[PDB]
Design a protein around this ligand. Structure first.
Ligand code: HEM
Ligand SMILES: O=C(O)c1cccnc1
Length: 153
């Protein structure tokens, strides 16, 4: 697909849709995560000692938002420029993932959790062309973070 002018137009449009509801889309996101992999719970400070995923924990929202922003930004960057640019941020990310005891087999957990979250976010407007466009953008960004973790470990 590549990211045509037509495909990027599709990712931007769908990200704008996600931001429109951070406490929902981010709590869903942690549930999709614990559905796919339960043990992941012990990883997160704000999830430990708890029995369910807190719905209004600011720490938790701030946390999940930041993750989706990072995947959008990556898609536009692909259409316009043709690539994903690795900065300070992407590298610090790689450090903290290792402190917290996170591995690569964890990544398809958080991907499916994000494609499923966006399919849920865009509903009937969903196209093969759009799925293809976020898939392309996650893959391309994960390729970069995994790359930095392996560097932070
Ligand atoms: C392209 C995919 C990913 C992106 C964009 C991303 C982004 C981030 C960011 C931005 C932070 C720090 C948040 C803060 O300062 O507020 C963080 C922390 C963390 N990440 Fe991820 N991440 C990704 C994949 C993963 C995966 C696959 C896992 C494993 C399940 C994971 C587990 C964690 C943990 C345990 C922390 C520490 C949270 C705490 O303070 O207790 N991440 N990540
Ligand atoms: O909340 C976090 O810090 C988080 C969630 C998913 C992936 N990475 C980090």
């Amino acid at each position: 697909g590549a990211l045509t002018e037509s495909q990027a137009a599709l990712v931007k449009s769908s990200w704008e849709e996600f931001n429109a509801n951070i406490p929902k889309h981010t709590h869903r996101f942690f549930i999709l995560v614990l559905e796919i992999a339960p043990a992941a719970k012990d990883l997160f400070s704000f999830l430990k000692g708890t029995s369910e995923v807190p719905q209004n924990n600011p720490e938790l929202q701030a946390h999940a938002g930041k993750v989706f922003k990072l995947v959008y930004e990556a898609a536009i960057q692909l259409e316009v420029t043709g690539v994903v640019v690795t900065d300070a941020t992407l590298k610090n990310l790689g450090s903290v993932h290792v402190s917290k005891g996170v591995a690569d087999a964890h990544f398809p957990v958080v991907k499916e959790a994000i494609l499923k979250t966006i399919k849920e976010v865009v509903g009937a407007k969903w196209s093969e062309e759009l799925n293809s466009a976020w898939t392309i953008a996650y893959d391309e960004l994960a390729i970069v973070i995994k790359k930095e973790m392996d560097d932070a470990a």
